[PDB]
């Protein structure tokens, strides 16, 4: 039973001041600043989270590999696969409908 | 509890030191000095405070470049 | 004497509106050629809840016809509008629910909500929850049409005023009895500061003109002239008839 | 450890030590004391020994 203290000057349990207590050599227990929990991306039509893209910080996406922040498909990364399957049929069935209408 | 009990939460300063007069008279919330009339261009002088004039006016300081001109 | 609570409400120190989480100004789109002489197509992206009003606000997303890019808007939701809808807002638009039309095209008896008061001010009349104004007639001689406001008064408007067809959503809001004090206190979350209202007769003579003596009463008639000075204007102002209506 | 003027920084102090004593500096740590003097903790290169520089200055 070791009682720890905040290592930064922040003394209030705010969202940005979350800490985790870990063990350390010799039974000492130290303090670590753990990061916040973030949301993933969302489809631009249905508002559902997209698969294949991790839920990390906005700047942390820059450090990811160029294939670790997209999905290899038309409108990949901004619309779900259901959100895109319907786009193609709209863009095609409509063209056939007004091809013969006029 | 209007006396000793309520005097415990006085730690939020209101007046800090001013820049043109040097007194602790800069009201943080009003953003103006109560003793030397800050950002207002004119030095704040009132005739009812005849003592507050002789506490800080011409002649009370070093007179770095005026003691020379009058001598000449 | 003092300055009564109606005199301190005009300065705006603590009585300003608590409009911080409000979505925005709900109104039509700016007048232009493509709406004066043609129709546009708007997509109702999603229905939202603007705090401080009982009528949902719909986020319509048009296309910029003169330039490249979207022209996002903010429309008060008429009842029946759903996500993914197509609403056309033009002079030649079809008389459906949600389609904005000039008031001069609607047949007599058509229901129009959010009617303008003057062509181009983007919505004045019949904006609250569950309210609507009904067209009455037309007059092609001077291009003016009569409508019946929700208060029952009938007003004459130019035929170019736009008015979204239908009734406003969120109707029948007030039929629910606020049961507690807390529910009535949370209703003013996004409004001004006026809920706990202390009676004039429960006040000292300085604060309110009704400040009574050894018995809690008024003492002088509450029906006042309209030309009273501010501060003494209390009770009922220019009352044509008082008491219960029998 | 020196006592520099406040208006310098960790750049014109790093050159001033190198130029005045002919040494190599790899780290400068500074603080502003209450009196206004800035105390600089100039760390010399591993090859150069601060003991022979200190005797040259006259500390010992």
């Amino acid at each position: 039973a070791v009682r720890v203290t905040y290592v930064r000057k922040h003394s209030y349990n705010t969202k940005s001041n979350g800490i985790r207590i870990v063990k350390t050599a010799g039974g000492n227990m130290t303090v670590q600043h753990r990061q916040k929990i973030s949301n993933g991306v969302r489809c631009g039509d249905c508002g559902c989270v997209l698969a294949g893209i991790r839920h990390i910080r906005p700047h942390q996406y820059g450090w990811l590999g160029k294939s670790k922040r997209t999905v290899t498909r038309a409108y990949g990364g901004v619309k779900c696969h259901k959100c895109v399957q319907k786009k193609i049929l709209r863009a095609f069935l409509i063209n056939e409908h007004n091809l013969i209408k006029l | 509890t209007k006396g000793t009990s309520c005097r415990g939460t006085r730690h939020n300063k209101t007046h800090i030191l001013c820049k043109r007069c040097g007194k602790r008279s800069w009201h943080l919330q009003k953003q103006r000095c109560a003793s030397c009339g800050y950002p207002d261009a004119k030095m704040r002088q009132y005739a009812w405070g005849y003592k507050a004039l002789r506490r800080r006016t011409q002649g009370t300081g070093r007179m770095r470049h005026l003691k020379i001109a009058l001598k000449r | 004497g003092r300055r009564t609570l109606s005199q301190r409400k005009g300065r705006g120190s603590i009585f300003k509106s608590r409009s911080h989480h409000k979505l925005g100004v709900a109104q039509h789109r700016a007048i232009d050629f493509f709406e004066r002489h043609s129709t546009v197509r708007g997509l109702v992206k999603s229905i939202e809840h603007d705090p401080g009003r009982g009528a949902p606000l719909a986020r319509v997303v048009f296309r910029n016809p003169r330039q490249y890019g979207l022209d996002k808007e903010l429309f008060i939701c008429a009842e029946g509008l759903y996500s993914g809808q197509y609403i056309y807002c033009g002079s030649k638009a079809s008389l459906h629910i949600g389609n904005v039309l000039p008031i001069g095209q609607c047949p007599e008896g058509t229901v129009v909500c959010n009617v303008e008061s003057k062509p181009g001010d983007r919505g004045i009349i019949a904006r609250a929850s569950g309210n609507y104004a009904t067209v009455i007639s037309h007059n092609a001689d001077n291009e003016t049409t009569r409508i019946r406001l929700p208060s029952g008064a009938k007003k004459t408007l130019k035929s170019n005023c736009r008015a979204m067809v239908g009734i406003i959503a969120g109707g029948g809001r007030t039929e629910k009895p606020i049961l507690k004090a807390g529910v009535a206190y949370r209703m003013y979350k996004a409004k001004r500061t006026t809920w706990p209202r202390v009676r004039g007769v429960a006040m000292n003579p300085v604060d309110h003109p009704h400040g009574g003596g050894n018995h809690q009463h008024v003492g002088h008639p509450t029906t006042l002239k309209r030309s009273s000075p501010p501060g003494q204007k209390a009770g009922k102002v220019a009352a044509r008839r008082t008491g219960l209506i029998r | 450890v020196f006592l520099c003027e406040q208006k310098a920084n960790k750049t014109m102090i790093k050159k001033a030590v190198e130029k005045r004593y002919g040494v190599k500096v790899i780290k400068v740590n500074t603080l502003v004391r209450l009196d206004g003097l800035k105390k600089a903790f100039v760390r010399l290169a591993p090859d150069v020994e601060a003991m022979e520089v200190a005797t040259k200055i006259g500390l010992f």
């Binding site: - | 030191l17 | - | 009196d35 206004g36």
Partner: protein
């Protein structure tokens, strides 16, 4: 306080520098009546209010 601005730390530094007594040699002059500093203060007697 823990966090003081630069223009505020240098004014505290002068108020500890001025909180010193008369030097010994000064009092031994001729006709020297300046035996004690009457502008002095302490942290627990008088808060300097600044």
């Amino acid at each position: 306080t823990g966090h003081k601005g630069f223009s505020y730390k240098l004014k505290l530094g002068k108020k500890i520098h001025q909180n010193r007594g008369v030097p010994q040699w000064f009092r031994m002059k001729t006709g020297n009546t300046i035996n004690y500093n009457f502008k002095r203060r302490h942290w627990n007697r008088r808060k300097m209010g600044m």
